[PDB]
Structures are given as C-alpha cells and as structure tokens.
Amino acid sequence: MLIAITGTPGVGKTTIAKLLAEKLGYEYVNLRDFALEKGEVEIDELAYFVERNVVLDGHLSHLMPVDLVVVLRAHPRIIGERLRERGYSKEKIGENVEAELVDAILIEAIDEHENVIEVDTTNKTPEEIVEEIIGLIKSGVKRRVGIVDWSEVYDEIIPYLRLGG
Amino acid sequence: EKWGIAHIYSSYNNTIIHITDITGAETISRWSGGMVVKADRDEPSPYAAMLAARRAAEEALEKGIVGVHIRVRAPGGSKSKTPGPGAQAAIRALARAGLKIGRVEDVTPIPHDGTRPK
Ligand SMILES: Nc1ncnc2c1ncn2[C@@H]1O[C@H](COP(=O)(O)OP(=O)(O)O)[C@@H](O)[C@H]1O
Ligand SMILES: [Mg+2]
C-alpha cells in the first residue's frame, strides 16, 4: 500500500506521515530526499523513480502514482503562523495561506486520483489525526473530500493574505 | 473617481468576493456563495458566485466605488488544468451590476516549499 501525505506547506505532512509510518508499521519516506538522491526536479522523472508499504511525505506526493492520497488540511491562519515560524517571506507566506484557502492541493489530488481522503487537522493532536486516518483506512474508506470550507473563516485569515494595492 | 480592488477566490467549496479600497487596508464589502444560497451543495455554483458578486458590487457602489481592478485566485487541477467558470462569472456579475472593470490580474496561488518543480 502506497499512501501519499500531501497538503499546503506547513500543514503537518511530515509530523503526521512519520507518526503514521510508526503506528501502521509502514516505512516513512520523504519525497524531497528521494528525488535528490535518485538524481528544480522533473515530475515525470520522479514519478518513474517512485514507481512496499510506504507513507510518502510531500506536497508533490499526490502527483505520484500512489494507492491512496491523504490531503491534510488546516485553518489557513495555522498555516500562516507556522510559515512565519519557518521564516518564509511575507509574499511566500501569503501565497501559501491563499493556497490553503482555495483548496489548491485538494483540487490537484482529486484531479490526479480516485482515492483521496481529506483530513482536517485543526484542533487535533498528531495522535488523534493518525488514529482518524487509521479508522478510515480500516473502515475502509477510499474517498472522502469536501469536508472543510475555509471561506467560512475568511475574516480571520485577512492579516496573512496578499491584499495590498 | 474612487477605485477599489475586487479579490475573487474560486475554491472547491465556494466563491469569495472581497472588495477593498485601493490600498487594500479598508474592506468595502465581503461576500461568499455561502452567504447567498441556502444549500451547501449550491455554494460552489457559478450562479452563487454571480449573486455573491452582485451583492458585493451593490455594497461597493453604495459606498462610492466607481470601479474595481481584479485580482483572481482560480486554482485548477494538475492533470487537466481547469479553473471553471466561477471566477469569470463573478467578474461579469460585477460589471453588470454597474462597476467599471480595471486591470485584471491572475494571482492564483502556487503552494510551495519542498521539492521545487520546473
Ligand atoms: N497536529 C498537530 N498539532 C500541533 N502541531 C503540529 C501538528 N502537526 C504539525 N504540527 C507542527 O507544525 C509544524 C509544521 O509541521 P510539518 O510536519 O513540518 O508541516 P509540513 O511537513 O506540512 O511542512 C511543526 O513544527 C509541527 O511540530
Ligand atoms: Mg514536512
């Protein structure tokens, strides 16, 4: 079983994927490292090279030929706070917060794959989240999408958005 | 001769029209598909986008805005890259409601940091 863990930068892909590999007893693989060590990166090339029981970590993981995609979501304010913590520029932060707001990755994943499970991480510990994913795979559910609408929180993410004229 | 900026976002679930002043600091109007339609399933509809935009435009006109420049966020898939009719429908609804349309710029956000494609 090949599971992609994808979502906006800062959403918790790495945290959740590592914990998931541990709890399911699968192997954890970070996509960046993999791409570098197998030699800008070409997506077709990467897709060949990926192609075990693997939790695959990256925001490009949904463009790879996996068995299941897990799209992690988070309130775009959380994305903003985390990307400020990383030291991203104001514009890069705004761009990513907006990407989360408009479901950019989700839209990509549903376009690429049939089995897409969307998970809202908001106000959850990594443990609660991994157990949620597990309960779903075990259920087993192949597809769940359309479970967050961040337009509903729009006023709260305004300070992070690229609004200046 | 007061001009604003219409920020238009088309998402998987909804459409947002946020009109600000020229600086972007002052909010003139903020409307979503979810504010104008009763049913969750109609929130993504381009008809909902059109009605939301109509309300935003009417508010902006009442507040003295003559025209809007547009900044559009319209994400589309990686395989087929299709934004859908919604963002453009909202723009058209802004025009028909009586706003002049200024510069139109596509700011559709690209999530990045990690691997960087070419
Ligand atoms: N469920 C969670 N609860 C609290 N903090 C989290 C959670 N998931 C991730 N984090 C924190 O958010 C930050 C970004 O997580 P990370 O896994 O690097 O995101 P990504 O891999 O999506 O870029 C990390 O410092 C991590 O400790
Ligand atoms: Mg990570």
Numbering used by the authors:
A (entry chain D): 1 to 39, 49 to 60, 66 to 179
B (entry chain F): 12 to 129
Authors' description from the paper:
Amongst the factors involved in this maturation step, Fap7 is unusual, as it both interacts with ribosomal protein Rps14 and harbors adenylate kinase activity, a function not usually associated with ribonucleoprotein assembly. Fap7 forms a complex with Rps14 that is conserved between humans, yeast, and archea. In addition, the affinity of Fap7 for Rps14 is higher with bound ADP, whereas ATP hydrolysis dissociates the complex.
Two crystal forms were obtained for the archaeal aFap7–aRps14 complex bound to ADP/Mg2+ and ATP/Mg2+, which diffracted to 2.1 Å and 2.4 Å, respectively. Phasing was performed by single anomalous diffraction on the ADP/Mg2+ crystal form with platinum-derived crystals diffracting to 4.0 Å (see phasing and refinement statistics in Table 1). Four copies of the Fap7–Rps14 complex are present in the asymmetric unit in both space groups, revealing a 1∶1 complex of aFap7 with aRps14. The structures obtained for aFap7–aRps14 in complex with ADP and ATP show subtle conformational differences. The ADP-bound state of Rps14-bound aFap7 superposes perfectly with ADP-bound hFap7 for residues of the P-loop and LID domains in the ATP binding pocket (unpublished data). It therefore seems that, in the ADP-bound form, the binding of aRps14 does not lead to major structural changes in the aFap7 LID domain. The Rps14-CE forms a lasso-like structure, which creates an extensive interaction surface, contributing 800 Å2 (45% of the total binding surface). Surprisingly, the surface of Rps14 involved in rRNA binding corresponds closely to the interaction surface with Fap7 in the aFap7–aRps14 complex.
